[PDB]
Amino acid sequence: GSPFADPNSLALANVPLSRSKRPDFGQRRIRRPFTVAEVELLVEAVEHLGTGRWRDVKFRAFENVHHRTYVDLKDKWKTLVHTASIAPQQRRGAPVPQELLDRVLAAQAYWSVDSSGRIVTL
């Protein structure tokens, strides 16, 4: 007395599996050297807004100096960020302090998703 024409579903098990991946590299056009002051203000302009309107960047940065263009500033930061994030041997930018790379990197991640760190546990 058994059933007929049934699906006979299995228990459905799970097997182990690994995962592999690889980073990426690149190179942009030839840029020009910047000043600690110009970079500081420039970074603060794009950082102050994180990733919204470039107009506020050019205005916040310095609406008086010999600025270039909204996108110019935004793009400038993005580029410096990639170079400050890439490998050390490849990170051969202008003679600037690590702070610049720390502010651009930290901010980039801060506005990215959540933040950068999760290592310290006071």
Swiss-Prot record:
Domain of life: Eukaryota
Domain SANT: 31-81
Domain HTH myb-type residues, every copy: 26-85
Subcellular location: Chromosome, Telomere
Disruption phenotype: Severe developmental abnormalities of vegetative organs and impaired reproductive organ formation. Chromosomal fusion in mother pollen cells. Increased telomere length and frequency of anaphase bridges containing telomeric repeat DNA.
Expression across tissues: Ubiquitous.
Region (Sufficient for telomeric DNA binding): 3-112
Protein name (Swiss-Prot/TrEMBL): Telomere-binding protein 1
Lineage summary: Eukaryota, Viridiplantae, Streptophyta, Embryophyta, Tracheophyta
Gene: TBP1
Parent-protein residues present: 506 to 615 of 633
